[PDB]
Design a protein around this ligand. Sequence first.
Ligand SMILES: Nc1ncnc2c1ncn2[C@@H]1O[C@H](COP(=O)(O)OP(=O)(O)OP(=O)(O)O)[C@@H](O)[C@H]1O
Ligand SMILES: Nc1ncnc2c1ncn2[C@@H]1O[C@H](COP(=O)(O)OP(=O)(O)OP(=O)(O)O)[C@@H](O)[C@H]1O
Ligand SMILES: C[C@@H]1C[C@H]2[C@@H]3CCC4=CC(=O)C=C[C@]4(C)[C@@]3(F)[C@@H](O)C[C@]2(C)[C@@]1(O)C(=O)CO
Ligand SMILES: [Mg+2]
Ligand SMILES: [Mg+2]
Lengths: 409, 259, 630, 641
Amino acid sequence: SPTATVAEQGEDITSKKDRGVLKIVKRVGNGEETPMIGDKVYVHYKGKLSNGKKFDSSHDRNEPFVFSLGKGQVIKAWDIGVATMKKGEICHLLCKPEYAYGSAGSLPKIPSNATLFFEIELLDFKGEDLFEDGGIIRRTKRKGEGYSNPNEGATVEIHLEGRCGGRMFDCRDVAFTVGEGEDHDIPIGIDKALEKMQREEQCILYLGPRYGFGEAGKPKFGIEPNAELIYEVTLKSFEKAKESWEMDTKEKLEQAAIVKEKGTVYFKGGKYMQAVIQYGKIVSWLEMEYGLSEKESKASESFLLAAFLNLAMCYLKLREYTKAVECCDKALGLDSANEKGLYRRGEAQLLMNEFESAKGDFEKVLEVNPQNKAARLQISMCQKKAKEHNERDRRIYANMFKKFAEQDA
Amino acid sequence: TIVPATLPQLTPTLVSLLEVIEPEVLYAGYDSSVPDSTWRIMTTLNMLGGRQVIAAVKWAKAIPGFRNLHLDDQMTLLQYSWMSLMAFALGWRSYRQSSANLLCFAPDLIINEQRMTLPCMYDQCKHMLYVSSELHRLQVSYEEYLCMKTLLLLSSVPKDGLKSQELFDEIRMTYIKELGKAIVKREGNSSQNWQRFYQLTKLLDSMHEVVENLLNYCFQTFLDKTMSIEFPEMLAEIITNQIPKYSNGNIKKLLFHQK
Amino acid sequence: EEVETFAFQAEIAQLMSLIINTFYSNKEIFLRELISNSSDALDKIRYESLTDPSKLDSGKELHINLIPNKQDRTLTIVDTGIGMTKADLINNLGTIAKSGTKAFMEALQAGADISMIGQFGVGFYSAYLVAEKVTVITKHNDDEQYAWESSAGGSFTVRTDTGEPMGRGTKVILHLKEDQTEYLEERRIKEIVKKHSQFIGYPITLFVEKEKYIDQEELNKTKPIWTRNPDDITNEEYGEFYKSLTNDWEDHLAVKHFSVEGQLEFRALLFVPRRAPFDLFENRKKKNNIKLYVRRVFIMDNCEELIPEYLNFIRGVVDSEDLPLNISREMLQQSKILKVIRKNLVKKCLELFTELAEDKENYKKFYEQFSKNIKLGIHEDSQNRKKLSELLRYYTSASGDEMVSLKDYCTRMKENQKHIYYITGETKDQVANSAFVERLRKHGLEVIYMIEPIDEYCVQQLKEFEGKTLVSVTKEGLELPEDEEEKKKQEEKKTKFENLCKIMKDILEKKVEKVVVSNRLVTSPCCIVTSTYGWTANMERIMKAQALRDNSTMGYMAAKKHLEINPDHSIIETLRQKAEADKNDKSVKDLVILLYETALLSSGFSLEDPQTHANRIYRMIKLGLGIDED
Amino acid sequence: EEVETFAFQAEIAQLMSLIINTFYSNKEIFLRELISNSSDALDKIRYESLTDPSKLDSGKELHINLIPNKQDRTLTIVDTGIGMTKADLINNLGTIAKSGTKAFMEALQAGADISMIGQFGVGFYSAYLVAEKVTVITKHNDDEQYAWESSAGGSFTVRTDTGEPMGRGTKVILHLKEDQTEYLEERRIKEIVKKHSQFIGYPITLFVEKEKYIDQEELNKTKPIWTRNPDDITNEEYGEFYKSLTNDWEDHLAVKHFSVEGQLEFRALLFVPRRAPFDLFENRKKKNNIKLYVRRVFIMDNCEELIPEYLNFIRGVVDSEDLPLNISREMLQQSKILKVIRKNLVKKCLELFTELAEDKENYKKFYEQFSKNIKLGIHEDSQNRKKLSELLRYYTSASGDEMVSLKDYCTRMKENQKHIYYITGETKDQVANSAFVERLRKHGLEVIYMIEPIDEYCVQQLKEFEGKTLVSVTKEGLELPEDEEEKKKQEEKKTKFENLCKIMKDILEKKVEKVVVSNRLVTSPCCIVTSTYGWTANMERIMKAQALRDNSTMGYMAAKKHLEINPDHSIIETLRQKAEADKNDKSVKDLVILLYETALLSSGFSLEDPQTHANRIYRMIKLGLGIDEDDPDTSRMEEVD
Ligand SMILES: Nc1ncnc2c1ncn2[C@@H]1O[C@H](COP(=O)(O)OP(=O)(O)OP(=O)(O)O)[C@@H](O)[C@H]1O
Ligand SMILES: Nc1ncnc2c1ncn2[C@@H]1O[C@H](COP(=O)(O)OP(=O)(O)OP(=O)(O)O)[C@@H](O)[C@H]1O
Ligand SMILES: C[C@@H]1C[C@H]2[C@@H]3CCC4=CC(=O)C=C[C@]4(C)[C@@]3(F)[C@@H](O)C[C@]2(C)[C@@]1(O)C(=O)CO
Ligand SMILES: [Mg+2]
Ligand SMILES: [Mg+2]
């Protein structure tokens, strides 16, 4: 059995000389010859146990095995593996028991030392992942602590190269807080990228069209690739954000007042993303049980309702009536007569071409405030738009049955 | 005139659906050059715990019947039984990986008897190994095991009940029925199936003690500050919110079987 | 003619063989019989002690001990009953078909309450079903201890007992057959005792060895509470009894404790579960659930003859006295008796449900689990439809989410109604919003929404309720209490629309029996309606979905279809005008098809093309979307 | 010590009572026993006459006569068998457990072929189930005639018979109970006799007075044939027998005649009818139409233990001469015997079906009537599933119009075709033209068309044929052996329309689990498929329609709908571009819904509320025809807080 023969054969790939990995690789194909590091790399493979036994597993279905982390994660044999893997390489790397199923093993089914090698056809391994929402390309040099990351509310110390997309901007080591994504012109998506970064993590961060200032066209950067703001960022230190379950009842009310003012400013400044962020913190705190008396609970409701309504407007400008609708619904669940929410939701509906719901909301605005002519105007507009749509249909569909009868020659 | 047709029975799939839903085991461990100090062991376990606990949430969401519960209740059940489920998962993995009453947590994490160095384990070995020893003694299979695991998800309620109670009760009977079937088709017995069912139920009922005692220890580890232990925010939030529910008696235990 | 007279004789050797080899179907019963005789022995002494307490001077505890002995491969059964004198060991154990018990009973005063297990004189001998040798040790108060022994070879012996004193009572020792050792196991014993003898009045203790010491385990802990006057039993007691009886954990939902004192005498407890029963553990599929006991001894548990299947969710016990039984005591003689019992069981089940229903919340809990069975009882068991139907509950248009009784529908009827209107369909919502009920809603008439597949089977039998006729609103010929002026208008409409009726029939020739002008629709231009005699769309879809089929089933049950036209509809007026202007306008042809086809779906029929429907729509979409022909 | 030894005794009075009152439940069997005694009497003389022919000098006809007498409430049974001498008369009728028959056989040499019915010694007394008194007159060749007479009073008498000579044999007269005259009626007799005798080796004549004269009818004209060597029986003979037994004007379709030797002796005949019974699965009476006889005497019927229900259409008889019976001879004593019988009967039925299948014409006739039973067997019988599957026949997309074998399928399959594909649905037309098979047909792959609702059960359990698994073409993940170039082209298509997948999903968030780009379609703009697990279309509607079911299970088992889009349809391409231009375009929203509703109908799902689909259509008609007649403070909104 050739797969058993190779159990003790191969070139030396080591960490440990008496264990390690046997390079029994049959060939290198079609792809870059450089060993590569990267995420979401899918490979196909078939194989056998080091003792020559056919393995009863997913390789017989050509499983598209994925390498989830840049330097590997779930198969010690293949992660030790990635370090020497090339695109197009057809690997046969037999890794001794320390790389098999671990100290526990996968027993009851598989003993810890029942190792394998497979004929693995490799996909390009260069490059780590981007982002769940897209907008950023992340590449790493050094892992951080692994037990600690910034969370919004914490100031962080970030080393910045000064570089950005082959160009320079006011990129400097910064004792960054989240509001700075807009206040200090620091690419805005950094606000969330930092929460995944671990202390002392070294990562190259590309901030794309909506993650960076591409769409904004900020002249402050003045970088032709304003939409590709890529440079090294190192998270060197940070403080700990106090969590909403760590913060006290009064502490959360106090911060809601502080944050509310920041949010108001951001809103007015056109910094709707930051306004949303500040209002986001306000709402998540306020939604929690505080143990307040009935009159004290109104400080919470006041901050909460205001945040919903401010968010609704931020979203009316940032998003096409999506979260804005939800915010209004929340504002109205809290206060069914708040004409601001009734009105703003009604606009969100009209602006999505939902004429019936828009009219209903504006009618409600006027029950609360019969003099709020804004709703009266919106109702008239809803009616007019509905008329326009009805006319378009007549232009297309009128007398189609005849058209069809004649086409049918 | 008309005779209603009889009904052939469709392949029951709840057990195989659960087999599909169950997640793969996660890795945990630490740099072996570091001794297994009280705080290192706890840290390794805490990080694994938070990751396994979140996997348990999507796992629960994926379960037929469960998924139709009001979301608040779905999350309530996960908190109240998070310990039950984790302990059960551990106990089974242990005894199947080895007949020894060890704790098998991850591909790289085993706590053998000589490694039960945490004060918490020394005091709770009688509870954490209650479960692995008993499942071993009864030679519990994977499938009847899964049926029981699901019932543990459904083993506790608020003292004030759930909103979708008239579903919850259905879901429990549904999985009770599946457990019965899981036993009958494998044992080949009659009166002994009745008894095996009760013998297994008794684990799940006695596990209420297993959990309160283990629970109080996890509360103590998180609450005090005597050990250099990192904890994930997830578990820390759960415990912060769970401690007063426990101490106020707001969590009700369910009794699965008598007779 | 001198005539010789002879007595009858018997051959003992063969008689013994029949006793052992051709009366019994099983071996469980060897224990059952030994225990029964033992309990009678105890009861006899208990009785004697009533007038002479000194009878118990030799010992007062009346109990039965089962003592298996694996090492010796034996089983010993011990009691403290009367015991036997030397004379009785010889007469009663040495005589086939002698019955000491019977003689005892015969010798009793008329007022005696000794509900003795009666007997034939054969049963002891069943011991040899499992034993190679049987030894009986006994002490009677009036005699010495003696040891009786036999291998049933046509003799037996009597020895003076020189061993340990008993005080009083009988000890039976079986020396078991080499290959039947399961009777030495705890599990087998417990199953047998529980199954046949759990209601014997004297405590039974099983003595076994474990780490060593002997574990004394009582088995018959439950009392046969049905023997008590019903008024003295609390709900907790019924509940506990029930749980032990059925190995449940839930309590009963309802119970009826009933007795009969006529030609036959018996008592029974019938329980209604709080949850529909299910096969938690393997059993005979659809075994019925009423057990029959005679004199507190289990006799039979799956007698189909006792109760209709629709009432098989009732759990319960019937305990009779003095029924003629088969020699094996496994079966009842004269099955005409079962017929009588069934009559009474059903009669009382109905009273229970009638009463249960007074509690609206509980009725709901009931009905949610058990409505299917009620409905089967309508379909079947025709003599009871008149009462069962009152237990039905339905959603109606005026009920919102409440279900109401048919009597509620009735009380709310208008003076012009002669009929109860109902509609059937797949879901609530599809029925409630249907075109078929638009004019009924207009005039404020109540409609019943029938939903379950079962409802279609059932509706066929329920022709009349309290004198009102039940009618469907999906059949042609629906009668509404309309005025003369509208009727005249309808005729005028027929006159102008008949041209379409004919044209549409020429179109679409094979799809309908006819096309008519209708007075039932408001907003729909049309619908598909069923014939007066025939089957509805719902019936067809049900029949076409069943596992059990024939060709004749639908060759016979297929529905006829008729197309109804809303005269008052704007599409319809357009067609009248267009079609009259040109009978061959091909666009009319296509419009006729879409109205029909759409009507088919909206009326509950499967669309068989089905692709053609989709294709017509795709063409319309291309236009709507601005996609040209090429 | 001194040990006394005693014999066992019996109390005759009680013994007599028990035999009469507790051993039997069916009074009618008294006739069965009187006849059995009689046939033994005849057979015994026949045996003796084999070596000594003078034994029959006293009379040569061996027969049984039944002579009811209305007028005197009596029944007489007459035979010409050995008869009894005075000594035998007293010893055998006066001893409760004596069996002369048993002794007789014991007195014979090994090799005698004769098999008697009796052996217990008590059957005679069953006469008293219906008789008040009985009289027995008998003549033995070696003695005079004697008349035995008694009530079951503990004693009996013997008289010299001073009446007419009977030549030879025994005459039994019952004086019937005043209330038991139903057994005196010609109809009832004949029915009992038919039921319990049927295959008695000697003829029975029933003598009935009519306007008078006596009508002498021979009962049991039909002889058992299973006792004969099968090689010796013509097909017509089997058919004649069959028709007689079943009152079937039609002949049998197939028959299997076999025997089993060793431990339990068997002979059996199994017949396959040419028509399925109309109530085959509906009758509420027991389904196994197999009768069990012992020594040619009927014992039992309607026993579930003998045959699995799926084979409840086989008509037949099982006969043995060695099984233990209870005292009434109404059942076997050891139920484990039935287990063995069943194993063998089933094995042979399957052999018969296999043989039948070789005749293509006959198999078709069979299958047309009984394919339901085969399919049920697949569902219920886990052991013979592996053979039963060979008997299935289905229409396929490449069979034209005849049904073919699963083997036929797999012998036409293509080198890269690793899987067997099938579709299920209401009718052949619907499946044949379904969107789901458009690519498969285009590539030349064969699809099995399953139609019956029961087909849905077989597809669960069959799983694979000769290692080739089954694939439903209505589920997600359908795999075709596509080329690399084809895959690359699809990869590019799949990075397009992503926005549509998302937009449509938002529109349909509450309707579908997913919206994806697909490849099973080549003509049609879209379709609905079900995910890997759960009920599929058809399976779900079937379950909903079951008359009796637990509806709560439908909250667990239900389809998970995925919407597949055909990227190379013009509707789809237009929407792609249009939707990208405006995410809220009202017309996009409206058209997406119609495609969805349409796809459900064409995909085999019911539609949730038809009075919407219809309304969408009605307004389109009105536009199409031009029928438009009925279808023609503010600053607070800006405030920031
Ligand atoms: N344990 C005992 N103690 C005292 N007397 C006994 C005992 N067992 C049997 N006998 C006596 O022996 C007699 C023999 O009756 P046997 O018990 O054989 O009938 P049976 O088993 O009651 O009959 P059946 O099976 O019809 O119920 C009884 O009538 C009784 O007087
Ligand atoms: N018509 C008859 N002619 C000759 N002998 C008879 C006749 N009827 C009865 N006998 C004799 O009486 C004996 C007793 O018969 P009986 O029917 O009681 O016993 P059995 O047939 O063994 O009972 P079972 O049918 O239960 O086995 C027979 O063995 C036989 O010798
Ligand atoms: C006594 C408690 C109970 C423990 C846990 C019991 C259940 C469990 C099962 C597993 O498969 C993995 C981790 C956990 C979830 C656990 F092992 C660890 O997290 C550490 C733990 C909380 C504890 O040991 C601590 O005191 C640490 O705070
Ligand atoms: Mg007795
Ligand atoms: Mg006889």
